[PDB]
Design brief:
It is classed as transcription. The entry lists the keywords chromatin, nucleosome, transcription. The structure is cut from a larger assembly and holds two copies of chain A, one copy of chain C, one copy of chain D, one copy of chain E, one copy of chain F and three copies of chain G. By secondary structure, chain F is mainly beta. Chain F is 0% helix and 44% strand. Chain F has no helices and six strands. Chain F is globular and about 25 Å long. Helix content of chain G is 46%, strand content 6%. Classes of the chains: A alpha+beta, C mainly beta, D alpha+beta, E mainly alpha, F mainly beta, G mainly alpha. The complex binds magnesium ion and zinc ion (ZN) (3 copies). Chain I binds one RNA strand through strand 7 and strand 8.
RNA sequence: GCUUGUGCUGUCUUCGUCCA
């Protein structure tokens, strides 16, 4: 599903179909993010039910996101080049 | 092992000409040795020492085995070639030109 | 120590409950999910004030799943211990390593290394107790202890007290 | 604050095609997940057809929140938007 | 589970010493700071509650909920059983027992007089609400005892602590 | 596991009578048999088959 | 370049930053699938033909409405209030002719894409209400005047009571109102189309409904649609022209291949 | 600019509706100066870094955004596409809420 | 519902805040320190701790679990480590920016060469945009070549002359006009010195330069500690049945770690400055080519085979890069492709689908009381008969593969479960032909299951697709949800696309022999007898049963 | 007494198919 097909689906106005194509029919992934630093550095043990961002030293302000696996890979490669992409779930102003 | 069948192989691990083959069926049986695990704790005849490296038929193809070649390579190990034959009849969607 | 706090909860409702009794069902679900819970950030939530007249607002339909998400804001009474605070307690169990007390729902453990030496543990006593010449502390006896450390769990709080300082011990 | 009072609503009073498609999809999904139906179905079984029947009779229990570019919004009921 | 009305608090570089919880230093953290905000965003003060005020509030709320659930038609056990959840029932039973066995003021009018004395007083206009709750809860008898139990009151020597304690003992039912 | 998997079989009834095949899948009575000449696999009930043995063709019941 | 451009619920065209690109999409707020080529009847012709087609004089007997097309043909001559209404209509038509001929279309072109096909609506009304036969019409002239005038103020592109909103709304429907007034003229309705009361009300309601249906829908991604609509002809295709000239235009090249001036001289 | 684009399009007899070319030249002249449809024109805007990097000069744009501590507000379609979210376009330009008042019937 | 339950609330991303990573943050988010170049412990499995494949960095194996989070390969995202560098090095992407900042400030007392007293500087301060603010400040302070000890009253200036700094390779040279002509000395500006100078810059001066105190600090452009990506970023491949080859990034990290140990040992034991310079330039080269191997004016880092090293930068750019190749467009599931054929007996919005494609593709239908009987009939039919089904999905998400189920006839369906039934008649599907020049290249059709292996189209839709039947192929996409099906059937359907917005005219018409025949049949001298008239009238689906006179 | 096994490389190069 190339870029031109994406533009055609934008021109149709079908946002739900585009989201389903690019996530459910493809690399859908779930990550946890700290609510303070906004980094994907949370250490989650789901069956032990314990979450922790060791850097920010917090256990309660943690959320889960559904993002493409390629987006996760891109953010990790950016982090490898010392760039800090921080994902926040609220606006500031 | 693979999900395909192995009953069409002979003792030497090679299929014989004249046999029907479907997709994924195994036509060349090959194994490579592997250092055995702690299964020497006792497994009389069922301890794994080999890993399967067999050649399956292409999943979209089927036909008859036409000829099986056996020889040795330049170095000196065995070397096999299997030829499959099938007939293709014209149908809707086939390309023709003048 | 008890406090009044403005709390919020996110409630997700399945489409099978989209009926006229949606508001009341959300209220009872909120009550069952809030009353008696223990969160380390806040402490212990004991009751919710005005529990039958809480505004729930309009729920937002989650895209791709149909279920509605509600933001419910409420005021509740919350209790949380603090480091270096002196509170009363009631002894619940006696052990050679120390005694276990109860401060409401919170259970506080005090080790012998935070107990004065004259309060020697007597296991032969009926019931077993940490007793001195003029003091006798056993199960059900009023004790005043100072909280030194607090341990936070996933949905539990563990507190450690001490009675080695003045104006503590038996009361 | 961001909400706009019902008397001074200035957006179009007609249901756009995107809103119609999204409302039909959401209602069909809810019906397929065992939500109560508000219209009498004669012999219909398909959730999308039941949702379309609900829309034609103005019985869909959903609200459309239209967002303005500055951040404010207007709330419109599915029963007060004209559908062709 | 439940989320406070205070949000944001993103990453920075500076570290402060007023971050650890400590009753003695009167550092209650951001979520229990002296300044709070309601659902409307207006200014709001931290609301401490003594055991008398807390007991009155929990009894009032519980009896209101019990009356509402019964169609508008006193025992602690039945009132605790009104609530739902076995762990919730145990927690409210433990709180009811703790409050009952340490209730300094079981009367509404006595609690009202105590709150008015501890709020409208000129000396108490500077007192932190946590200090007020601790004084009304612990039932101290001496200035030295109160200072030892509550180290924050040591730095506030402009408070008529002894006469306030004697008034509290007088209001306390023997 | 059925005793008829990967065994040469002959069809005795229906529209494919007298065609030699090999049993590939056998779950509940609907044996999947590949046909030697038509490059295809067809479903067939166990009643319509004839399993080869050392002494001529045997029916399904008389073999299992 | 155009991917993030969308029509919003206030009618404006904006990008992802909220910067306004157009205060109304297409300067008329219409969908690109809802317009057809129509002729504006006040633009072409001579002054004699325009006067003959549109002017109705109730004093001169040979330059009035015909007597076999109206049942009220007797008590019509000599009226002054009705003559004032007809004069107001004619002055509005003359203003429209001046506006279109002098500001909008100066070369006389009058076949332009507009919404709501009026010819189709008129012939549909004629077929539905059986407007054949020499039967006189019961449609009074003030009814025609007030119906057309009210119709020309219900074509809502923008909603609101602000004065700027009203000015933008009046601006957005100028050409379409000119088309409607040129078609639904009193003499034309009475003689060429021969509508009656029911047919007239049906035509007015149909025009209003179809104009409401021709507006662009908020949420449209008109930027991507414009990009595809411009790039698609480029796929199937001494002054440089074609793809190199399109590249020069889109890159804003400083040194184009064939610079040129178009110099116009004074009349003499 | 509209006249030149119209000349180029209409020379070979083709026809394009006015609104498309009007939107194009309005984007090309909205900033007060001529903005070319190139990386020098498009990527010198105030749009989000994630939206600009997906066109051209990805790594340079990301390095500049990191060094400048840029904040992407994720309002564009490209950011939501590459984050796997419902883009605020078409059917995603509004929210759907549950009507409790109507449900009483 | 394909992910295991988590008590963390589910939210979406509203803002992305960019910035640089500080050494404190790199150390804090790390789970292990990497100091051993050897990948394998003793060539006997169980990779060495503290190495580049430490088991705390994450698990990329089926049977092994991550020792940091305890999750399996499918769920573990990977964890970062760090690698302390013996000497600081330049970040290859920020060297011109470091040069410009060095021009902007004073190399001895870390202060801007000009203050707000200059009105032009105040105007440069006023602009909010950090890039333009930095540009203006740089355009001003570049001219100023001397720190001012007193105000042009002491501004704190040390008075020293500002050198001219020129870039060559990755090395900056600062030419001081030491005290008309004299002998000027150009000395190397080592990364440690610039780092120390940047560290003294006040926060307010940092803000004046367009940097941010919290997220983008000027001394963080110098690498003192290197974050180590998890194995998920740099997976190993299986070259043959036995030997497995390491990723390029792993080899480059091994080279970096060897150079670091070399620098450290050299400094500790004995220090001839020339050898220090050589080995430290080798370390700088390795760190620079680990991130950017397309550096102009110097040779590329090569593999043992002679192919150049694949750097991180080259993973993110081009058609096959991360952005264009895996985010703006990707490969998707639930799709089909085959040759297309014409069908005069199909409706305009219908598509003919081969039976094998209908068996392969599926739609997950929710079990309700309106369809439970039909769905259990489909489940009884199985995955090899049409109409059948392939999977039964429980509420908890467990799939039941109907191929390998011995009691598929004894499966009872509960309300709320999902059945992945085969593609059926009248299911909406999206149909597409490349290149997709306009939005009529993707339209939603209705499925009709037919024999033979081609897709079938009405001939009037061949114009918007620009397709013919001499070998063309077209793609098909199956929606997987009720909302997505409604979107396809109400927005993208073929009848809704008849009139295009490009030229406000139809894009579909009567074509080819239908056009020729309609011209021939409507000629004035064409007459038809009663029997043929009856046949043609019965051929009309919309005919009302009344024969005309 | 006897029970059916559960998956796949990477990187280049060349030749082709349908548009353009
Ligand atoms: Mg072709
Ligand atoms: Zn964090
Ligand atoms: Zn892990
Ligand atoms: Zn200086």
């Amino acid at each position: 599903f190339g870029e031109m097909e994406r533009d055609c689906m934008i021109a149709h106005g079908a946002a739900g179909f585009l989201k389903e194509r690019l996530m459910e029919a493809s690399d859908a992934f779930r990550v946890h993010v700290c609510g303070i630093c906004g980094l994907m550095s949370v250490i989650a043990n789901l069956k032990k039910n314990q979450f922790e961002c060791r850097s920010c030293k917090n256990k309660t302000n943690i959320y889960q996101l559904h993002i493409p696996y390629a987006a996760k890979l891109l953010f990790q490669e950016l982090m490898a080049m010392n760039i800090a992409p921080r994902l926040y779930t609220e606006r500031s102003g | 092992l693979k999900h395909g069948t192995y009953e069409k192989l002979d003792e030497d691990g090679l299929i014989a000409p004249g046999v029907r083959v479907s997709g994924d069926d195994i036509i060349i049986g090959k194994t490579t040795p592997i250092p055995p695990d702690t299964e020497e704790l006792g497994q009389r005849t069922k301890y794994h020492t080999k890993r399967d490296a067999s050649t399956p038929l292409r999943s979209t193809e089927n036909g008859i085995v036409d000829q099986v070649l056996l020889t040795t390579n330049q170095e000196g190990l065995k070397f096999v070639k299997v030829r499959m034959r099938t007939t293709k009849v014209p149908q809707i969607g086939d390309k023709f030109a003048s | 120590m008890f406090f009044l706090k403005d709390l919020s909860l996110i409630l997700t409702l399945h489409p099978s409950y989209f009926g006229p009794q949606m508001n009341q069902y959300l209220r009872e679900k909120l009550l069952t999910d809030v009353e008696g819970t223990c969160t380390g950030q806040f402490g212990y939530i004991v009751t919710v004030l005005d529990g039958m007249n809480i505004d729930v607002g309009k729920g937002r339909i989650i895209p791709g799943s149909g279920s509605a998400e509600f933001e419910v804001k409420y005021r509740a009474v919350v209790w949380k211990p603090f480091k270096g605070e002196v509170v009363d307690a009631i002894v619940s169990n006696v052990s050679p390593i120390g005694f276990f007390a109860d401060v409401g729902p919170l259970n506080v453990f005090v080790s012998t290394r935070l107990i004065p030496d004259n309060l020697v543990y007597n296991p032969s006593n009926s019931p077993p107790a940490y007793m001195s010449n003029d003091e006798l502390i056993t199960k059900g006896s009023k004790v005043r202890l100072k909280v030194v450390g607090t341990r936070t769990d996933v949905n539990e709080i563990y507190a450690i007290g001490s009675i080695k300082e003045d104006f503590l011990g038996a009361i | 604050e961001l909400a706009i009072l019902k008397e001074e609503r200035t957006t179009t009073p007609y249901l756009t095609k995107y809103e119609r498609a999204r409302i039909l999809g959401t209602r069909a999904l809810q019906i397929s997940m065992n939500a109560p139906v508000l219209v009498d179905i004669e012999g219909e079984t398909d959730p999308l057809q039941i949702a379309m029947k609900e829309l034609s009779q103005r019985k869909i229990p959903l609200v459309i929140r239209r967002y303005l570019p500055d951040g404010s919004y207007e709330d419109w009921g599915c029963d007060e938007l004209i559908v062709d | 589970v439940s989320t406070s009305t205070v949000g944001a608090r993103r990453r920075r570089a500076k570290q402060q010493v007023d971050d650890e919880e400590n009753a003695t230093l009167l550092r209650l953290g951001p979520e229990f700071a002296l300044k709070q905000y309601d659902h409307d965003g207006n200014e709001h003060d931290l609301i401490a509650l003594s055991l008398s005020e807390s007991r009155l509030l929990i009894r009032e709320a519980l009896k209101a909920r019990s009356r509402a659930r019964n169609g508008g038609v006193i025992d602690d056990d039945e009132l605790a059983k009104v609530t739902s959840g076995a762990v919730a029932n145990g927690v409210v039973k433990k709180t009811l027992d703790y409050l009952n066995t340490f209730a300094r003021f079981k009367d509404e009018e006595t609690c009202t007089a105590v709150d008015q004395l501890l709020h409208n007083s000129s000396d108490c206009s500077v007192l932190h609400p946590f200090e007020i709750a601790q004084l009304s809860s612990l039932g101290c008898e001496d200035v030295d005892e109160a200072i030892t139990l509550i180290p924050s009151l040591a730095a506030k020597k402009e408070v008529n602590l002894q006469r306030i304690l004697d008034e509290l003992n007088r209001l306390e039912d023997p | 596991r059925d005793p008829t998997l990967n065994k040469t079989v002959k069809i005795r009834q229906g529209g494919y009578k007298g065609k030699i095949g090999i049993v590939k899948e056998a779950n509940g009575d609907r044996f999947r048999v590949e046909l030697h000449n038509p490059n295809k696999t067809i479903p067939i009930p166990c009643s319509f088959l004839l399993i080869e043995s050392t002494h001529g063709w045997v029916p399904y019941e008389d073999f299992v | 370049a155009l991917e993030d451009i969308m029509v919003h619920y206030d009618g404006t065209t904006r990008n992802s930053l909220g910067d306004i690109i157009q205060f109304l999409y297409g300067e008329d707020g219409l969908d690109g699938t809802q317009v057809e080529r129509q002729t504006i009847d006040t633009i072409p012709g001579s002054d004699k033909a325009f006067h003959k087609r549109y002017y109705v004089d109730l004093m001169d007997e040979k330059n009035s409405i015909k007597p076999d097309v109206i049942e009220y043909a007797a008590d019509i001559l000599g009226d002054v209030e009705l003559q004032k209404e007809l004069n107001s209509e004619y002055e509005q038509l003359v203003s429209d002719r001046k506006f279109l001929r002098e500001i909008v279309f100066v070369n006389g072109d009058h076949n332009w894409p507009l919404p709501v096909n009026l010819r189709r609506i008129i012939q549909n009304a004629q077929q539905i209400f059986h407007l054949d036969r020499a039967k006189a019409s019961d449609l009074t002239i003030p009814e025609i005047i007030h119906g057309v005038r009210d119709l020309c103020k219900k074509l809502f592109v923008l909603r609101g009571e602000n004065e700027l909103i009203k000015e933008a709304q009046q601006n957005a429907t100028s050409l379409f109102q000119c088309l409607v007034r040129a078609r639904l003229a009193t003499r034309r309705i009475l003689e060429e189309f021969r509508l009656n009361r029911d047919a007239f009300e049906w035509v007015l309601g149909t025009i209003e409904a179809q104009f409401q249906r021709s507006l662009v829908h908020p949420g449209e991604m008109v930027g991507v649609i414009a990009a595809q609509s411009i790039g698609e002809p480029a796929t199937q295709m001494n002054v440089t022209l074609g793809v190199p000239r399109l590249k020069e235009i889109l890159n804003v090249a400083k040194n184009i291949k064939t610079p040129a001036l178009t110099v116009y001289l004074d009349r003499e | 600019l509209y006249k030149e684009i119209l000349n180029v399009i209409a020379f070979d007899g083709s026809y394009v509706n006015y609104r498309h070319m009007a939107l194009l030249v309005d984007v090309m002249t909205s900033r007060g100066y001529l903005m070319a449809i190139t990386r020098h024109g498009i990527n010198r805007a105030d749009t989000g870094a994630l939206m600009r990097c997906s066109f051209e000069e990805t790594v340079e744009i990301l390095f500049e955004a990191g060094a400048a501590a840029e904040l992407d507000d994720c309002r564009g379609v490209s950011e939501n596409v590459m984050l796997g979210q419902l883009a605020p376009m078409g059917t995603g330009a509004f929210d759907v809420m549950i009507d409790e008042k109507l449900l009483t019937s | 519902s394909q992910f295991p339950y988590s008590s963390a609330p589910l939210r979406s991303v509203k803002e992305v805040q960019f910035g640089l990573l500080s050494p404190e943050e790199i150390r804090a988010i790390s789970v292990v320190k990497i100091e051993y170049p050897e990948i394998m412990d003793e060539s006997r499995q169980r990779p060495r701790e503290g190495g580049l494949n430490d088991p705390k960095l994450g698990s990329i194996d089926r049977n092994f679990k991550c020792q940091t989070c305890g999750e399996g390969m499918a769920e573990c995202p990977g964890h970062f480590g760090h690698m302390e560098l013996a000497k600081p090095v330049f970040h290859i992407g920020f060297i011109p920016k470091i040069k410009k900042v060095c021009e902007c400030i004073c190399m001895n007392c870390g202060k801007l060469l000009l203050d707000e007293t200059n009105p032009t500087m105040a105007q440069a301060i006023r602009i909010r945009d950090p890039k333009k603010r930095f540009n203006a400040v740089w355009q001003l302070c570049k001219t100023k070549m001397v720190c001012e000890a007193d105000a042009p009253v002491s501004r704190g200036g040390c008075g020293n002359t500002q050198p001219v700094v020129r870039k060559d390779g990755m090395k900056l040279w600062g030419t001081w006009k030491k005290s008309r002509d004299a002998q000027p000395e150009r000395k190397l500006l080592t990364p440690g010195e610039i780092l120390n100078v940047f560290k003294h810059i006040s926060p307010e001066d940092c803000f004046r330069l367009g940097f941010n105190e919290d997220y983008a600090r000027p001394e963080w452009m110098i690498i003192t500690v290197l974050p180590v990506p998890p194995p998920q970023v740099r997976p190993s491949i299986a070259m043959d049945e036995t030997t497995q080859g390491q990723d390029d990034l792993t080899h480059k990290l091994s080279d970096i770690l060897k150079a670091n140990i070399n620098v450290q040992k050299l400094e500790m034991d004995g220090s001839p400055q020339h050898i220090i310079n050589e080995v430290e330039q080798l370390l700088q080269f390795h760190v620079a080519t680990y991130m950017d191997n397309d550096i102009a004016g110097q040779p590329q880092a090569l593999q043992k085979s002679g192919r150049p090293v694949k750097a991180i930068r080259a993973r993110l750019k081009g058609k096959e890069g991360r952005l264009r190749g895996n985010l703006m467009g990707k490969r998707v599931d639930f799709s089909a492709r085959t040759v297309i054929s014409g069908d005069p007996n199909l409706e305009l919005d219908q598509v003919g689908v081969p039976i094998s494609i209908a068996k392969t593709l599926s739609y997950p239908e929710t079990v309700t009381q309106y369809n439970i009987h039909r769905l259990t009939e489909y489940v009884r039919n199985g995955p090899n008969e049409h109409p059948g089904a392939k999977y039964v999905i429980r509420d908890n998400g467990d799939r039941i593969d109907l191929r390998y189920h011995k009691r598929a006839g004894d499966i009872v369906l509960q309300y709320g479960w999902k059945v992945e039934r085969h593609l059926m008649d009248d299911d909406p599907v999206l149909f597409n032909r490349q290149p997709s020049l306009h939005k009529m290249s993707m339209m939603a059709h209705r499925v009709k299951v037919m024999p033979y292996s081609t897709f079938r189209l009405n001939l009037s839709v061949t114009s918007p697709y620009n397709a013919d039947f001499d070998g063309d192929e077209m793609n098909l996409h199956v929606p997987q949800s009720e909302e997505t099906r409604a979107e396809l059937s109400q927005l993208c359907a073929v009848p809704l696309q008849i009139v295009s917005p490009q030229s406000n005219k139809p894009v579909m018409g009567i074509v080819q022999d239908t056009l020729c025949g309609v011209r021939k049949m409507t000629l004035r001298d064409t007459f038809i007898e009663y029997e043929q008239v009856m046949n043609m009238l019965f051929w009309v689906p919309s005919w009302d049963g009344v024969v005309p006179q």
